[PDB]
Write a protein that binds this ligand. Structure first.
Ligand SMILES: *[PH](O)(CCSc1ccc(CCCCC)cc1)OCC
Ligand SMILES: *[PH](O)(CCSc1ccc(CCCCC)cc1)OCC
Ligand SMILES: [Cl-]
Lengths: 798, 816
């Protein structure tokens, strides 16, 4: 028996959607301290209320109390010693002080601005760690520093001339370019040295900043529509499409000297004694960089172009020399560099799948001595699972004369590994990406981390010793997925957590127990920062399940059961898909904020299936690697298998009436489904589809698919715009949605698809969101999308 | 009493129908005619007739000729053979009758050939000789020098060049374009018609050869001169339009004067160069008005037209103010231009040397409270020696509100002027008294003077040949009248057809391209014969065919023209495609096809089956197709088209509906519950207006490339009809359909939007902004784009797709 949905009018559907729409603190900082043990600073937006700086006070004892959000006036930089906060707001840079001297505020303060003699925006501000009088920023693609006390400002780099013709001005300093931001999750191009040196002479403080210089001259340009549509203009962007040139890159060191008063006596640009391209010829990208805590060595994390070969490399300051046009000066400087100064490759990761860039690298101070370096490192390529390892490298300098031009041989600068011991292991992951981090207590010799040990459906907080690794203690309660911040003193932590059934809350927990057994400290709930909002009456949590493919692989999925289900009757079904790498849709956390519309579907009597197929993350490199060089192929197989399983198990699925719908990669796969499984999928709604892989960027596309010339078959197979002949020659089976200003998945993708559909004589329906980028931010756009989708389903799913 | 239902077909079904209709049509016309008399009493041919045409077994246009016989058999039809001259393709050519030189662009280059003159006539195809250049990039807008055909002109990188075709010498004359990398830093051109001039003023050149040489310099140097427009687009707004190579994801920068914003800074200037007896270029000189153009002519926004008197005595220009309600025809003598120089001391010397009795002369002035349409007819007669007057023919519309021929005599009045002093003109500065102004034509009908229409004047016989709507607004015909003895107008073309005529320079023969709603076009040559002492009544006789009319397909059923009177008692014409295989007592679904805007007339007695085949296709599937020329449309006088002044949107739909209601009442097979409105451009605008303002009339609208917001359209067009936005906020708001999305239907499947992505007349912005507002007001829409298309859908698969989509949309959603 066939369940049909009530057909409603357009305004009826608007009423439903408008009605549904009626239905968090972050960037936490614990600070030691009356009856208050600590103050917790954070960002938040209360009920009624833009986002602002807030704090809350933790008592020494609490009753065997929901913490009040106190006001202080998207990110902020903080100096624990001085209590200096620095933050952007209202198109300027502001600062305030709390803690340290003058104790703690008991009432809101006015934020003191830092005005300038600078033209245009001041981006990517950071305080100088060694000396909080100073801070840094980028201005017209160059690095500046300034003094908050004196008001002095100094430009350090001279890459960007600021010429009239923008295409004739390719060089930047301190800047993360497009692919680095979008595909490598790095938003800065410079790094404060944490210490001052006193190089000699008058003994003036020298401060140092490592920075990436880039030259985008050879990189391809594209034009994207400006947001102010009425101007009918575009902006130019350097977009390295797969197979094209990435930027020319190079690490440099800026230094400047300061007196006792804090006045800037001098500055200088330094560069590597040989070119970066000479020393590191097979590096395509700088993934990450930083410094050892002592400032003895700068370090960088390098990637080759295929993203199969990563290196952590130390660069000492002595390896940089004054930049100069004078050839005679250059050679003199190169000659003056000690022979025992050199780069040291302290680690190398290699794989035949790909290098996922993990953020975890913790270099220990050289308590041992100057002859070696110990560090913690997240490594995935060893076991195919991301785990913590304690590595020790040997730093013995081979003689080098840097005045000579020099060609690196095989394994140049490679350090012997004295020790390499795995602190974690097993068929589960330490989470080391996209904000996940470790916290290391050198007093107790313990590493805190998050992982999927208990289950891939839940993030939990664990603890292990890095001296003599053994028992792994979990600190978080099962039946929830947890996102944790640790106090700097390792006494308390925050968990933002939820489950599929319970909306999110934010709790502070206390680590209590005998100090002589720190590994087995007990977590005890202390206070709440936010209790869970009430689940709306018209909200029914989805049900997580799992099943085993014909190839004997465990896949997880969800079902939103049709509300007011009756037995016997089969309901029309929406397969909601993403299906691409770096994502996991199915886990035990609350879906009602981001995916409310799926519940709305189910309330009208659509069944909603979600399947995390092979390619999805939190399941190890082998699982995700299944789609290597053949995107589209594996993924659809698993979507079908999961749909068929759910029909068999749950019984209320009408397989004659299935819609496939996703965004981005999900839009791509929606089209693959209709192309390759027309008898499964009656309709497709493809959001912002990738239709041609040749038109996507280097960083992402090449990682997973190689360059086009090396994988013609895979590119062609997985480029849905090339397979338009196989799309249905029946109307009302294909709806395309795309934001016009999208600068990730260019509108080009949809435009070229439509172009090919016209050439193939195929029917299509189309909706554009003229004011939207990739993600639909504006609420009217969202409502319109949702109403369009409900209408489409009610009309064209029988 | 009962409703007809259209057969619902599958998508593939509809594709079969559309693909079939394109083949089964089975419907190439030669053009740009030049008669030349043969100077051989022995041979059998009176003339050779040169033209452009796509011959048999050939896919490109080329230069062709036909031999015109001295005698023809009376009731035998001679079909003339198209001979080739040469061993897409060629779109135009310049021709010098005396020397027999042809000049034309082809294969990304310049070519030339000769036939006639002293050389005599080819009996077989000849190879076209290329003209080599050292110039980078294209050589545009070439023209032969009238005074000396050894020279020709062209534009290269927005500057004026001349060359010698014999010697091969080339010399640049203007130095406006610096050739910088950034185009925004390099905004000046010479010889070039800018966007609004081309698109909205129908002008595609910015330079004009002086027709005569002069001999200043006792060394025996000959001087040759070119009038040209110099422009500066610095202050003009830039917009970006997507490049046609989509895969590059880039745009082109364009200077787009949007209504209200800055048009280019303009000026007329004079380039001269001197030649020796060998034909070498001895010297060149950029000259400019003795005072600035902006000083002399401060109210001039646009140069519509320009040229020279036949003797080269005066350059002339047709000027327009920004409102386009004030036009002046202005004579400019070469002596008013001085050498350009940065040296201010040298400039003053030159200014001091300019005689006091050298000045401009405003020989005609046209003023209206509607708008000035630019008519191309202005013919100055030669002056007697030492005469201070100029006689000329002029087409004037604003006087009676109908475009007619006048013979004007103006008196060239010297006020006497000190050109060293900075100049400020008063009212009526340079204004020339009008001694005489005879009406050669009159009545409630038009002499056609636009969009290719022209006159031909025979100074021997004192006769002026012209085209008009005298007989009917539904047909263009060829007429003749005397400009001496104004009186009887003789018609020269056959009634029951609309005609487009080309006249021989010797007034002995002419060509007519003509057709009717029922008959496809033909091209026939006619001979004007009779006693020479009665030239007004020369008889046109069919002589030969250039192209016979194709057989009207069996599948094709001509529409029927009709007319009616509005409630205000205004006569509107319309046409009706009756549903094929009509059965009585059935009421059929109906498609209102609309354009509705100025400068167009949809309804006239000419063949619609080429351009509007799909309207017949609609009728074959059982839709009635209605077309109404309401008020606003052309060929009915300035008053009729002026109806929509400052209120576009308002009057037009009322007339469309009144006509629809008339057609239902008269014909009886119209189902008023099932009417769709469909149009492109202005028609797209109106399709949306219809749905907004008459939702009870129009069940669905299909809006092609709609104008949705008038603030986003250009100066030339928008301001002519609506003023600038600041002066007409009410009109702009009322007629901008994207500002009335709240009034669009909140029921799906009543609105389909179509737009080419590369359209650079109606920017895609229009559709984007509409969609934006529809989203904001929670309205449903369907959308189709054509990524590779500009305004007109050229590529055939795009067109088929459009047609199939339209049929599907109608068959699915045109119900009650
Ligand atoms: P779609 O799946 C991408 C939608 S836009 C987007 C959103 C987030 C990110 C960050 C990924 C992590 C960086 C290391 C990139 C792009 O298109 C993919 C083909
Ligand atoms: P649409 O009708 C724009 C069509 S593109 C075009 C075609 C012809 C001309 C010359 C004369 C203008 C009246 C047809 C210009 C532009 O209308 C948008 C306003
Ligand atoms: Cl005369």
């Amino acid at each position: 028996a066939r369940f049909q949905v009530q057909k409603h009018s357009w305004d009826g559907l608007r009423s439903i959607i408008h009605g549904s729409r009626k239905y968090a603190p972050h960037d936490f900082q614990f600070v030691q301290k009356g009856p208050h043990s600590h103050r917790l600073y954070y960002l938040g937006m209360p009920y009624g209320s833009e986002n602002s700086l807030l704090y809350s006070e933790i008592p020494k004892k609490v009753r065997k109390l929901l913490l009040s959000w106190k006001q202080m006036l998207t990110s902020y930089d903080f100096h624990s010693e001085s209590g200096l906060f620095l933050f952007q707001a209202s198109n300027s840079l502001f600062h305030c002080r709390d803690g340290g001297k003058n104790g703690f505020m008991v009432s809101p303060m006015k934020p003191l601005e830092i005005k300038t003699q600078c033209s245009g925006p001041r981006m990517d501000p950071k305080i100088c760690p060694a000396d909080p009088a100073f801070f840094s920023f980028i201005n017209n693609s160059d690095l500046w520093v300034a003094n908050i006390e004196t008001g002095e400002e100094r430009r350090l780099t001279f890459c960007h001339q600021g010429l009239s013709n923008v295409l004739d001005d390719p060089k930047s300093a301190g800047v993360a370019t497009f692919v680095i931001q979008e595909e490598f999750d790095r938003f800065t191009g410079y790094w404060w040295c944490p210490t001052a040196s006193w190089e000699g002479s008058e003994g003036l403080k020298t401060l140092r900043i490592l920075y990436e210089e880039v030259d985008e001259s050879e990189v391809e340009v594209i034009h994207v529509p400006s947001p102010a549509l009425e101007e009918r203009k575009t902006d130019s962007y350097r977009y390295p499409r797969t197979g094209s040139k990435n930027p020319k890159i190079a690490l440099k060191l800026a230094e400047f000297q300061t007196d006792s008063q804090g006045k800037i006596v001098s500055t200088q640009e330094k560069e590597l004694v040989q070119p970066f391209s000479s020393l590191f010829p097979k590096v395509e990208y700088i993934a990450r960089a930083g410094w050892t805590r002592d400032g003895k060595y700068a370090w960088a994390m390098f990637l080759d172009r295929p993203q199969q070969w990563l290196q952590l490399v130390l660069l000492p300051p002595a390896l940089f020399i004054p930049s100069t046009e004078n050839e005679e000066q250059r050679l003199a400087s190169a000659r003056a560099v000690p022979r025992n100064v050199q780069p040291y490759v302290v680690y190398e990761e290699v794989t035949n799948v790909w290098i996922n860039v993990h953020d975890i690298f913790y270099p220990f101070p050289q308590s041992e001595g100057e002859d070696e370096l110990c560090f913690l490192r997240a490594n995935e390529c060893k076991t195919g699972f991301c785990h913590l390892y304690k590595v020790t490298a040997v730093l013995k300098s081979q003689g080098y004369d840097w005045s000579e031009p020099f060609s690196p041989g095989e394994d140049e600068f490679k350090c012997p590994i004295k020790e390499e011991i795995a602190l974690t292991s097993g068929e589960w992951e330490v989470l080391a990406r996209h904000g996940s981090k470790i916290w290391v207590n050198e007093e107790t010799k313990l590493v805190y981390f998050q992982g999927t040990k208990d289950t891939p459906l839940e993030h939990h907080l664990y603890v292990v010793s890095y001296e003599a690794a053994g028992e792994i203690v979990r600190l978080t309660t099962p039946g929830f997925s947890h996102s944790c911040s640790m106090s700097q003193n390792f006494d308390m932590f925050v968990s933002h957590y939820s489950s599929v059934s319970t909306p999110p809350c934010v709790h502070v927990y206390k680590l209590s127990g005998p100090d002589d057994d720190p590994l087995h400290k007990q977590p005890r709930f202390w206070a709440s920062m936010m209790e869970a909002a009430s689940c709306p009456p018209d909200y029914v949590p989805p049900e997580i399940f799992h099943f085993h493919t014909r190839s004997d692989v465990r896949l997880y999925g969800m079902i939103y059961k049709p509300h007011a289900l009756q037995p016997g009757k089969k309901h029309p079904t929406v397969l909601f898909v993403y299906g691409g790498p770096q994502v996991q849709l199915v886990n035990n956390s609350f879906k009602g904020i981001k995916y409310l519309r799926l519940n709305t579907l189910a309330s009208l009597g659509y069944a909603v299936v979600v399947i995390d197929g092979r390619g999805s993350c939190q399941r190890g490199l082998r699982f995700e690697g299944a789609l290597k060089n053949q995107m589209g192929q594996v993924e659809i197989e698993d979507q079908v298998e999961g749909l068929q399983f759910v029909a068999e198990k749950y019984g209320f699925i009408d397989l004659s009436r299935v819609a496939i719908h996703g965004w981005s990669y999900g839009g791509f796969l929606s089209l693959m489904g209709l192309i390759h499984k027309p008898q499964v999928f009656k309709v497709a709604i493809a959001g912002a589809p990738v239709t041609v892989w040749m038109a996507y960027d280097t960083g992402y596309t090449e990682r997973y698919m190689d360059v086009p010339e090396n994988n013609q078959h895979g590119y062609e197979a997985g480029s849905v715009a090339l397979h338009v002949e196989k799309l249905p020659n029946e109307p009302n089976r294909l709806l395309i949605l795309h934001g016009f200003l999208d600068e990730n998945v260019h509108f080009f993708h949809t435009n070229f698809l439509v172009s090919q559909l016209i050439r193939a004589g195929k029917p299509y329906q189309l909706q554009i969101y003229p004011n939207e980028r990739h993600s639909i931010r504006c609420p009217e756009s969202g409502e319109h999308y949702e109403v369009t989708l409900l209408h489409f389903l009610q009309e064209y799913l029988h």
